Amino acid sequence: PLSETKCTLKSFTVEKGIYQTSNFRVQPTESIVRFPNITNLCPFGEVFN
């Protein structure tokens, strides 16, 4: 964090204060794919079986 501050400010010394060095983001853990409920299974079997 202090090195984040120093490279952000392009300095080897830092004055008292708060400096924004980055942006925090939480990344996805899992993917949710939900297609509509299927009741309408297609009767291919009526021809094949």
Q: What residues line the site for another protein (CB under 8 A)?
A: 20, 23, 25, 27
Return the number of the residue (24 or 48) whose C-beta is nearest another protein: 24
What is the CB-side half-sphere exposure of residue 12 using CA atoms within 13 A? Answer: 0
Q: Which does 29 bind (CB under 5 to 8 A by kind): ligand NAG, another protein, none?
A: none
Least distance (Å) between residue 23 CB and another protein? 5
Name every residue whose Cβ is closer than 8 Å to that of residue 22 and which is 6 or more positions away in sequence.
Answer: 4
Q: Radius of gyration of the chain from Cα atoms?
A: 28
Binding site for ligand NAG (CB under 6 A): 45, 48-49
